Amino acid sequence: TVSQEEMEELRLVARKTWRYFEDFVTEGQNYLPPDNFQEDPPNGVAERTSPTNIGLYLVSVIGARDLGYITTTEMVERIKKTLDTIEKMEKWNGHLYNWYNTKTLEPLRPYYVSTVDSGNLVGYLITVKEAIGEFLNKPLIDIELAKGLKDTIKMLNVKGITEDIFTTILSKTTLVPSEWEAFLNKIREKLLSSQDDLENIKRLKNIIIALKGEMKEFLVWTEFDESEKEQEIFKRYKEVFEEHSSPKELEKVYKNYLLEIEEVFKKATEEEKALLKSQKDKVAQALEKIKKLEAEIENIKSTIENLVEKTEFRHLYDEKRQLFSIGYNVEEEKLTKSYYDLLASEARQASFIAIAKKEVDKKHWFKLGRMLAIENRYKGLVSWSGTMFEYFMPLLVMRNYQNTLLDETYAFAVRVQKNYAKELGIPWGISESGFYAFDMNLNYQYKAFGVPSLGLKRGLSHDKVVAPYGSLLAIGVDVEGVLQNIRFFKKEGAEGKYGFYEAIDYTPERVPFGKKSAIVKSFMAHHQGMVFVALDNFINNNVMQKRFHKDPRIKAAQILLQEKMPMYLDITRE
């Protein structure tokens, strides 16, 4: 069990991690996240993005709202725009390409379609589809938007603006808009006075501008002048405006106030009619906006659903090997030689969604290579690399059922990975990450760092590159362990503006002499996403998972994860 103090830290890290997207997903990047931002070598923000990057941002957006880092409106918006962009991008049989340029929105040079990239993205979309609906009956003013600002405040740090400020508001199971209006303005005021870094101040203003923004627009019952507040009609509806702040709970309250305005408009003074008329006219638009919000949502859900059923996975499957190829090389109009011949592989998310879409046989799932490695007692599927990501990238959306083959394995991985790492005295979670070497232009290189045990086919080496993203991608399992790693990462200085730096390179060959560890002063959008989502997942009981499985086609197949690990196994040969 996690202490409130503990959680608060995890939440802050989530906030810092979300910031990546806040900051680098620009109009200019066509509302896509760019692969990475490099700090120390300050080459800045790389203007390329992968299907996966994009998907993880979209599900992160949802995740943002979950923690209270954006508003219901803000949410829908970013998704709308990002999707508008997606609906543009040069596709292949309804697939996104390997890479696009964030500005040219052009397929990048080695015109390629990655199976995994598509597979992941599709999943992340399906997740968003089943999720976004929820927010039509989830309050525009809910407590989480305050729990959220708390994290925002801790992060931004601007004088008088301190954590304790909250206390009261957060002490209540519910947030009552009046208290909120007050609290938001109180904070607006101590900001006008506090003379910290104008820049830092600005952000908190705009993040308080955003919060009142939703409220003024959608809860216009705050913007009725003292004479309008008198109209008896208002004094019946006062406690029902406070008791209901969801877009549908408002849609209903707002009509029933607009039909009652109409009724009592005949039995009213010309003074009472002018005041009743002002209130009709405001609450009218306020409804028209809710109708639009509801619509923009369905358009999203529909647009997503489409883009998914448009994605022809058929094309990346060698029917004859009953197996998924790495991806399609568009330049030789040929499918790639090698394949995802293993269950323990990010490919599963691809492999699963295919069967769930009924694009390949339910059998495919069982043709994927299942290899156990019995280490000490614990047994578990080996992967092609040993990267935590190979095992846990699915677990963002793909569920885990207890005692299942996967389950045994998901634990197995954490153990071996933590042993390997304690036996090297580095924090655990060695996975595909950047490391302290650079191309001619001084950009951190990025390579597959497994543990060679879980690494069916591995060059061993010292390659001691611990990436935090991999550690956190398993919060689910050894929360205790991951927490330790996080402290250990802070002490080794991996803490930064946008959460945890890409990786720490302990590798002898590459560490600068008279130093141990070369922190890869980088933030990679895809990894940032995984961390963010994985945190949300941990905090709100595998939410994103339960949303992905809210999809019927997914629920159709959900039994495949409930595969149990066999009790007997032959050993002979021929």
Author numbering: 1011 to 1584
What does the study report here?
Cyclic β-1,2-glucan synthase (CGS) is a key enzyme in production of cyclic β-1,2-glucans (CβGs) which are involved in bacterial infection or symbiosis to host organisms. BaCGS is composed of three regions responsible for the following steps: initiation (covalent bonding of glucose to CGS), elongation of linear β-1,2-glucan (LβGs) chains, adjustment of chain lengths of the glucans, and cyclization of the glucans by transglycosylation. Here we performed functional and structural analyses of the cyclization domain of CGS alone from Thermoanaerobacter italicus (TiCGSCy). In the present study, we explicitly showed that TiCGSCy domain alone produced CβGs by transglycosylation reaction without hydrolysis.
